[PDB]
Short mmCIF file of N, CA and C in Angstrom, two decimals:
data_model
loop_
_atom_site.label_atom_id
_atom_site.label_comp_id
_atom_site.label_asym_id
_atom_site.label_seq_id
_atom_site.Cartn_x
_atom_site.Cartn_y
_atom_site.Cartn_z
N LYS A 1 49.11 1.93 16.53
CA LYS A 1 49.93 2.19 17.68
C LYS A 1 50.13 0.93 18.57
N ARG A 2 51.22 0.92 19.30
CA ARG A 2 51.55 -0.16 20.24
C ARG A 2 51.58 0.50 21.59
N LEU A 3 50.47 0.86 22.17
CA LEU A 3 50.42 1.51 23.47
C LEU A 3 50.81 0.83 24.75
N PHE A 4 52.05 0.28 24.85
CA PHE A 4 52.47 -0.34 26.05
C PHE A 4 53.99 -0.39 26.12
N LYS A 5 54.59 -0.19 27.23
CA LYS A 5 56.04 -0.23 27.34
C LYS A 5 56.59 -1.66 27.51
N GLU A 6 57.44 -2.05 26.54
CA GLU A 6 58.03 -3.39 26.63
C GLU A 6 58.63 -3.56 28.00
N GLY A 7 58.20 -4.59 28.68
CA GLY A 7 58.71 -4.85 30.03
C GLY A 7 57.89 -4.25 31.17
N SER A 8 56.79 -3.58 30.83
CA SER A 8 55.95 -2.96 31.84
C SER A 8 54.90 -3.89 32.44
N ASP A 9 53.99 -3.36 33.25
CA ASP A 9 52.93 -4.11 33.89
C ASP A 9 51.61 -3.70 33.29
N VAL A 10 50.87 -4.64 32.77
CA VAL A 10 49.57 -4.34 32.17
C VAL A 10 48.46 -5.02 32.99
N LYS A 11 47.27 -4.42 32.91
CA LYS A 11 46.14 -4.94 33.58
C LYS A 11 45.26 -5.70 32.56
N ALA A 12 44.67 -6.80 32.99
CA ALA A 12 43.83 -7.52 32.07
C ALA A 12 42.70 -6.57 31.56
N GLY A 13 42.53 -6.48 30.29
CA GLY A 13 41.46 -5.65 29.68
C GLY A 13 42.02 -4.38 29.13
N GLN A 14 43.31 -4.19 29.36
CA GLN A 14 44.07 -2.93 28.94
C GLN A 14 44.38 -3.04 27.45
N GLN A 15 44.06 -1.95 26.72
CA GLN A 15 44.38 -1.95 25.31
C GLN A 15 45.91 -2.04 25.13
N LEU A 16 46.39 -2.95 24.29
CA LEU A 16 47.79 -3.10 24.12
C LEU A 16 48.20 -2.66 22.71
N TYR A 17 47.27 -2.72 21.78
CA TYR A 17 47.54 -2.38 20.45
C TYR A 17 46.32 -1.72 19.87
N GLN A 18 46.46 -1.08 18.68
CA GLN A 18 45.40 -0.43 18.00
C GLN A 18 45.55 -0.71 16.51
N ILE A 19 44.64 -1.47 15.92
CA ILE A 19 44.74 -1.79 14.54
C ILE A 19 43.96 -0.67 13.84
N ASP A 20 44.51 -0.17 12.70
CA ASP A 20 43.91 0.93 12.00
C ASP A 20 42.41 0.52 11.74
N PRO A 21 41.52 1.13 12.45
CA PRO A 21 40.08 0.95 12.41
C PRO A 21 39.36 1.69 11.31
N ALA A 22 40.17 2.27 10.48
CA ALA A 22 39.66 3.08 9.34
C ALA A 22 38.54 2.43 8.54
N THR A 23 38.86 1.24 7.98
CA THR A 23 37.84 0.65 7.17
C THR A 23 36.78 -0.09 8.00
N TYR A 24 37.23 -0.78 9.03
CA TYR A 24 36.25 -1.45 9.87
C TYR A 24 35.24 -0.46 10.38
N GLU A 25 35.76 0.63 10.91
CA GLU A 25 34.81 1.63 11.39
C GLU A 25 33.93 2.17 10.28
N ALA A 26 34.49 2.14 9.10
CA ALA A 26 33.79 2.55 7.85
C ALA A 26 32.70 1.56 7.47
N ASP A 27 33.02 0.29 7.39
CA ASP A 27 32.09 -0.76 7.07
C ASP A 27 30.97 -0.81 8.05
N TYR A 28 31.32 -0.63 9.30
CA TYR A 28 30.31 -0.68 10.36
C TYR A 28 29.30 0.42 10.20
N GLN A 29 29.77 1.69 10.00
CA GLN A 29 28.82 2.80 9.82
C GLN A 29 28.09 2.57 8.60
N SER A 30 28.71 1.94 7.61
CA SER A 30 27.96 1.66 6.35
C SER A 30 26.86 0.70 6.61
N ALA A 31 27.19 -0.42 7.26
CA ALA A 31 26.22 -1.45 7.60
C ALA A 31 25.03 -0.85 8.34
N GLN A 32 25.27 -0.14 9.41
CA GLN A 32 24.19 0.49 10.16
C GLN A 32 23.31 1.42 9.32
N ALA A 33 23.88 2.04 8.35
CA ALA A 33 23.16 2.92 7.48
C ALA A 33 22.11 2.08 6.77
N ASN A 34 22.62 1.02 6.15
CA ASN A 34 21.82 0.06 5.41
C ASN A 34 20.68 -0.49 6.29
N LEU A 35 20.99 -1.05 7.46
CA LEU A 35 19.99 -1.58 8.35
C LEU A 35 18.92 -0.54 8.64
N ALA A 36 19.37 0.65 9.11
CA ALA A 36 18.42 1.72 9.38
C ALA A 36 17.43 1.85 8.28
N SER A 37 17.88 1.69 7.02
CA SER A 37 17.06 1.79 5.86
C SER A 37 16.08 0.66 5.76
N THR A 38 16.61 -0.53 5.48
CA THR A 38 15.78 -1.76 5.34
C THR A 38 14.85 -1.99 6.46
N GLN A 39 15.28 -1.72 7.68
CA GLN A 39 14.38 -1.88 8.87
C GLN A 39 13.15 -1.10 8.64
N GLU A 40 13.25 0.20 8.39
CA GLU A 40 12.12 1.06 8.20
C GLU A 40 11.25 0.46 7.07
N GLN A 41 11.88 0.23 5.94
CA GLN A 41 11.23 -0.33 4.75
C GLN A 41 10.33 -1.52 5.17
N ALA A 42 10.88 -2.42 5.95
CA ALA A 42 10.13 -3.59 6.45
C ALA A 42 9.00 -3.16 7.34
N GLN A 43 9.30 -2.51 8.46
CA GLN A 43 8.27 -2.09 9.39
C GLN A 43 7.05 -1.44 8.69
N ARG A 44 7.35 -0.75 7.59
CA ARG A 44 6.26 -0.13 6.81
C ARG A 44 5.43 -1.19 6.12
N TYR A 45 6.18 -2.02 5.27
CA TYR A 45 5.53 -3.07 4.54
C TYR A 45 4.77 -4.08 5.47
N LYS A 46 5.12 -4.12 6.73
CA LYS A 46 4.41 -5.02 7.63
C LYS A 46 3.03 -4.52 7.88
N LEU A 47 2.80 -3.24 7.72
CA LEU A 47 1.44 -2.73 7.91
C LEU A 47 0.68 -2.66 6.57
N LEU A 48 1.37 -2.84 5.48
CA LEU A 48 0.68 -2.80 4.14
C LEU A 48 0.05 -4.13 3.82
N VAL A 49 0.72 -5.25 4.24
CA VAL A 49 0.15 -6.52 3.93
C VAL A 49 -1.06 -6.64 4.85
N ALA A 50 -0.99 -6.08 6.00
CA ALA A 50 -2.02 -6.01 7.02
C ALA A 50 -3.28 -5.46 6.35
N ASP A 51 -3.09 -4.68 5.31
CA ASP A 51 -4.28 -4.14 4.63
C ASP A 51 -4.28 -4.51 3.11
N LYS B 1 -43.16 -0.27 -28.95
CA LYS B 1 -44.56 -0.58 -29.00
C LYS B 1 -45.39 0.46 -28.34
N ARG B 2 -46.61 0.63 -28.80
CA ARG B 2 -47.57 1.54 -28.23
C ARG B 2 -48.70 0.62 -27.72
N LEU B 3 -48.53 0.03 -26.53
CA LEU B 3 -49.51 -0.89 -26.02
C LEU B 3 -50.83 -0.39 -25.38
N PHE B 4 -51.59 0.32 -26.14
CA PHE B 4 -52.91 0.79 -25.67
C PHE B 4 -53.77 1.09 -26.81
N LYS B 5 -55.13 0.84 -26.65
CA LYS B 5 -56.01 1.12 -27.74
C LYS B 5 -56.48 2.57 -27.72
N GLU B 6 -56.28 3.30 -28.79
CA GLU B 6 -56.70 4.66 -28.85
C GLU B 6 -58.19 4.72 -28.51
N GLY B 7 -58.56 5.50 -27.53
CA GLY B 7 -59.95 5.57 -27.15
C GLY B 7 -60.31 4.59 -26.04
N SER B 8 -59.36 3.84 -25.51
CA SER B 8 -59.67 2.90 -24.47
C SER B 8 -59.58 3.51 -23.04
N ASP B 9 -59.67 2.61 -22.02
CA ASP B 9 -59.59 3.06 -20.63
C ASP B 9 -58.26 2.50 -20.05
N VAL B 10 -57.48 3.37 -19.49
CA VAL B 10 -56.24 2.91 -18.91
C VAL B 10 -56.22 3.20 -17.39
N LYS B 11 -55.46 2.43 -16.67
CA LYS B 11 -55.35 2.63 -15.23
C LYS B 11 -54.06 3.34 -14.88
N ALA B 12 -54.04 4.22 -13.96
CA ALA B 12 -52.82 4.94 -13.58
C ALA B 12 -51.74 3.89 -13.30
N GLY B 13 -50.55 4.00 -13.85
CA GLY B 13 -49.48 3.07 -13.58
C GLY B 13 -49.33 2.06 -14.68
N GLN B 14 -50.27 2.05 -15.61
CA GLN B 14 -50.28 1.11 -16.74
C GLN B 14 -49.29 1.53 -17.78
N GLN B 15 -48.45 0.59 -18.23
CA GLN B 15 -47.52 0.90 -19.31
C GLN B 15 -48.23 1.30 -20.59
N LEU B 16 -47.95 2.46 -21.14
CA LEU B 16 -48.60 2.91 -22.34
C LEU B 16 -47.74 2.74 -23.54
N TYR B 17 -46.41 2.86 -23.39
CA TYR B 17 -45.47 2.79 -24.46
C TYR B 17 -44.26 2.03 -24.04
N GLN B 18 -43.43 1.65 -24.95
CA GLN B 18 -42.17 0.93 -24.59
C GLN B 18 -41.09 1.51 -25.55
N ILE B 19 -40.14 2.24 -24.89
CA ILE B 19 -39.08 2.81 -25.67
C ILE B 19 -38.02 1.71 -25.76
N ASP B 20 -37.42 1.58 -26.98
CA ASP B 20 -36.39 0.54 -27.18
C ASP B 20 -35.37 0.64 -26.08
N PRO B 21 -35.25 -0.36 -25.19
CA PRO B 21 -34.30 -0.46 -24.07
C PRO B 21 -32.90 -1.08 -24.20
N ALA B 22 -32.49 -1.49 -25.41
CA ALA B 22 -31.10 -2.13 -25.58
C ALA B 22 -29.90 -1.42 -25.02
N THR B 23 -29.76 -0.13 -25.31
CA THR B 23 -28.64 0.64 -24.81
C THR B 23 -28.81 1.03 -23.36
N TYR B 24 -30.02 1.38 -22.98
CA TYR B 24 -30.26 1.78 -21.56
C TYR B 24 -29.86 0.61 -20.72
N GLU B 25 -30.33 -0.59 -21.08
CA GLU B 25 -30.00 -1.82 -20.37
C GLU B 25 -28.47 -1.94 -20.36
N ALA B 26 -27.87 -1.53 -21.43
CA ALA B 26 -26.41 -1.68 -21.59
C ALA B 26 -25.66 -0.61 -20.72
N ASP B 27 -26.10 0.65 -20.81
CA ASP B 27 -25.44 1.63 -20.01
C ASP B 27 -25.58 1.33 -18.51
N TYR B 28 -26.72 0.80 -18.11
CA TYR B 28 -26.95 0.43 -16.73
C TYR B 28 -26.00 -0.62 -16.27
N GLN B 29 -25.86 -1.67 -17.03
CA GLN B 29 -24.95 -2.76 -16.65
C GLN B 29 -23.56 -2.19 -16.60
N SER B 30 -23.27 -1.31 -17.55
CA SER B 30 -21.99 -0.68 -17.62
C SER B 30 -21.71 0.12 -16.30
N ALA B 31 -22.64 1.02 -16.02
CA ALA B 31 -22.58 1.86 -14.80
C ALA B 31 -22.23 0.96 -13.62
N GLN B 32 -23.10 -0.04 -13.35
CA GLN B 32 -22.92 -0.92 -12.20
C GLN B 32 -21.59 -1.57 -12.12
N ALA B 33 -21.02 -1.86 -13.32
CA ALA B 33 -19.69 -2.48 -13.36
C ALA B 33 -18.73 -1.50 -12.72
N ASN B 34 -18.78 -0.25 -13.23
CA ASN B 34 -17.98 0.86 -12.73
C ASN B 34 -18.12 1.01 -11.22
N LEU B 35 -19.30 1.21 -10.77
CA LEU B 35 -19.56 1.38 -9.30
C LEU B 35 -18.89 0.25 -8.53
N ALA B 36 -19.27 -0.99 -8.85
CA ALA B 36 -18.70 -2.13 -8.16
C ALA B 36 -17.24 -1.94 -8.01
N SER B 37 -16.60 -1.45 -9.04
CA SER B 37 -15.16 -1.25 -9.05
C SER B 37 -14.75 -0.10 -8.09
N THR B 38 -15.05 1.13 -8.43
CA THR B 38 -14.75 2.22 -7.57
C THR B 38 -15.05 2.00 -6.12
N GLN B 39 -16.27 1.46 -5.81
CA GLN B 39 -16.69 1.25 -4.45
C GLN B 39 -15.64 0.50 -3.72
N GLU B 40 -15.24 -0.69 -4.25
CA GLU B 40 -14.21 -1.49 -3.62
C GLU B 40 -12.96 -0.61 -3.37
N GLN B 41 -12.50 -0.05 -4.49
CA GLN B 41 -11.28 0.86 -4.48
C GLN B 41 -11.34 1.78 -3.31
N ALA B 42 -12.51 2.43 -3.10
CA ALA B 42 -12.66 3.38 -1.99
C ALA B 42 -12.57 2.60 -0.66
N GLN B 43 -13.51 1.69 -0.43
CA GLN B 43 -13.52 0.92 0.83
C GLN B 43 -12.15 0.51 1.25
N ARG B 44 -11.28 0.14 0.26
CA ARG B 44 -9.94 -0.25 0.61
C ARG B 44 -9.15 0.95 1.10
N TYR B 45 -9.10 1.99 0.27
CA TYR B 45 -8.37 3.24 0.66
C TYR B 45 -8.80 3.83 1.98
N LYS B 46 -10.08 3.50 2.39
CA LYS B 46 -10.57 4.04 3.60
C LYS B 46 -9.83 3.45 4.79
N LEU B 47 -9.24 2.29 4.58
CA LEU B 47 -8.49 1.62 5.67
C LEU B 47 -7.02 1.93 5.56
N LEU B 48 -6.59 2.46 4.40
CA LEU B 48 -5.19 2.77 4.23
C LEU B 48 -4.84 4.13 4.84
N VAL B 49 -5.72 5.09 4.79
CA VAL B 49 -5.48 6.42 5.41
C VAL B 49 -5.46 6.13 6.89
N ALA B 50 -6.36 5.22 7.31
CA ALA B 50 -6.50 4.87 8.69
C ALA B 50 -5.14 4.44 9.25
N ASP B 51 -4.25 4.03 8.38
CA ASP B 51 -2.90 3.60 8.77
C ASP B 51 -1.82 4.41 8.08
#
């Protein structure tokens, strides 16, 4: 979408366009899934070397 | 060996006979090997449940 009227007044910080976030939003959620996983994995292993 | 003279005088605690000790000495060393093993195994696991 192009959410602004050609010739109008916009405020700095105002969304002017919207790029299809479909995949980006997808990769991001994907990434976080992975991190959530590995993070735990690590935190656990950090106590195993300890012993 | 039967280390005493038939008809002699013996003192309490005096060895009178000697049973062949080869395997006994062997089973004993064997046993100790095992213990040394399991013991460690346990002592370690005792700190793992702790965490």
